From Swiss-Prot, chain A:
Summary of the function given for this chain in its UniProt record: Attaches the virion to the cell membrane by interacting with host receptor, initiating the infection. The major receptor is host ACE2. When S2/S2' has been cleaved, binding to the receptor triggers direct fusion at the cell membrane. When S2/S2' has not been cleaved, binding to the receptor results in internalization of the virus by endocytosis using host TFRC and GRM2 and leading to fusion of the virion membrane with the host endosomal membrane. Alternatively, may use NRP1/NRP2 and integrin as entry receptors.
UniProt-reported outcome of changing residue 25 to G: In strain: Beta/B.1.351
Organism per entry: Severe acute respiratory syndrome coronavirus 2
Subunit structure, interactors included: Binds to host ACE2. RBD also interacts with the N-linked glycan on 'Asn-90' of ACE2. Cleavage of S generates a polybasic C-terminal sequence on S1 that binds to host Neuropilin-1 (NRP1) and Neuropilin-2 (NRP2) receptors. Interacts with host integrin alpha-5/beta-1 (ITGA5:ITGB1) and with ACE2 in complex with integrin alpha-5/beta-1 (ITGA5:ITGB1). May interact via cytoplasmic c-terminus with M protein. May interact (via N-terminus) with host bilirubin and biliverdin, thereby preventing antibody binding to the SARS-CoV-2 spike NTD via an allosteric mechanism.
Sugar attachment sites: 44
Residues of the full protein shown: 191 to 239 of 1273
Annotated gene: S
Highest taxon in the source lineage: Viruses
Protein name as catalogued: Spike protein S1
């Protein structure tokens, strides 16, 4: 799981690893995501791949 | 490309020897250029 956030000139990328087993859709459960890296970089990303 | 009466080689070779005296010695010069953009400072000593 990734959460791409960019607030106040700070790029926050959280991490979460989960062993998953469900068939099709997003599961009925809860998970917080903990910060691994904070980056104080001002970038105006427009494409990704 | 040949030295003449009004032409000489711009790149004089350094004549560094281990025994050449003060002034003709090789001198290692490192210029650290620091930039202070609005991003936080990254390289320095720790806070005491």
């Amino acid at each position: 799981e990734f959460v791409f956030k960019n607030i106040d000139g700070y790029f926050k990328i959280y991490s979460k690893h989960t062993p998953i087993n469900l068939v099709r859709d997003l599961p009925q459960g809860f998970s917080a995501l903990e910060p691994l890296v904070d980056l104080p970089i001002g970038i105006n990303i427009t494409r990704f791949q | 490309g040949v030295e003449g009466f009004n032409c000489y080689f711009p790149l004089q070779s350094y004549g560094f020897q281990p025994t050449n005296g003060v002034g003709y010695q090789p001198y290692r010069v490192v210029v650290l250029s620091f930039e202070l953009l609005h991003a936080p400072a990254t390289v320095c000593g720790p806070k005491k």
